[PDB]
């Protein structure tokens, strides 16, 4: 049902094209990136604080000093990526900030979509495509995908409407 | 392309106003 809602918002609202969803996607993938990179960096900059190969027992919660080397981590990411965190508190605030801001931005977009205020179309490219049949982008292909999905899904997805679409009005490409 | 007539001014102002705010704040820092 959630997958239906997701595909419905693609076909009827062009929700992938909405910049508020793009900020949501950036926030969620950045939060996943920050989680993975932060965990890997800490686990690979750990201090040798125990004699076992099992490094997990070289930590106690009541200790005062850091369990991993922020200096080594900073030097590594500065030489690998160009920049690096130098502030632990800023690092963790950023790990908070990125997915929460993504969720808030996607929520603003969903609020827009509630009133059918979509980023459905780029009107310049449709005006050109209506005038010029040689003009094709990936945007116009996505528009055609949305039309096909709407026409083939709406009689089953909205049965209260009694949408009778005869087979000859259904948009379809050659041979399929 | 038949674009919005205000798209250029909106894009330049949307970029340039907070850019100016950030540059003002950075350059005065340490005063």
């Amino acid at each position: 049902g959630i997958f239906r809602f997701i595909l419905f918002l693609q076909g009827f609202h062009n929700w992938t094209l909405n910049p508020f969803h793009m900020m949501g996607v950036a926030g969620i993938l950045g939060g996943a990136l920050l989680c993975a990179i932060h965990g890997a960096t800490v686990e690979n900059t750990l201090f040798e604080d125990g004699e076992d190969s099992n490094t997990f027992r070289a930590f106690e919660p009541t200790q005062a000093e850091e369990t991993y080397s922020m200096v080594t981590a900073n030097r590594f990411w500065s030489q690998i990526f160009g920049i690096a965190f130098s502030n632990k508190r800023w690092l963790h605030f950023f790990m908070l900030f990125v997915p929460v801001t993504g969720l808030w931005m996607s929520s603003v977009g969903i609020v827009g979509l509630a009133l059918n205020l979509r980023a459905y179309d780029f009107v310049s490219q449709e005006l050109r495509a209506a005038e010029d049949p040689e003009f094709e982008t990936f945007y116009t292909k996505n528009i055609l995908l949305n039309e096909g999905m709407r026409a083939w899904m709406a009689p089953q997805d909205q049965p209260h409407e009694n949408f009778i679409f005869p087979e000859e009005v259904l948009p379809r490409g050659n041979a399929l | 392309m038949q674009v919005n007539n205000l798209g250029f001014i909106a894009s330049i102002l949307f970029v340039l106003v907070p850019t100016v705010f950030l540059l003002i704040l950075f350059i005065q820092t340490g005063k």
């Binding site: 500065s78 160009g82 | 392309m1 250029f8 970029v15």
Partner: peptide, 30 residues
């Protein structure tokens, strides 16, 4: 003419990337 605006904003991001790498505040142990 929108292509100029797109090129400018992409160039601003890439210039910010260069100046943030090349001219970062150096991390100092103190």
């Amino acid at each position: 003419m929108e292509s100029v605006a797109y090129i400018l904003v992409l160039t601003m991001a890439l210039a910010v990337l260069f100046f943030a790498i090349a001219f970062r505040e150096p991390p100092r142990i103190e």
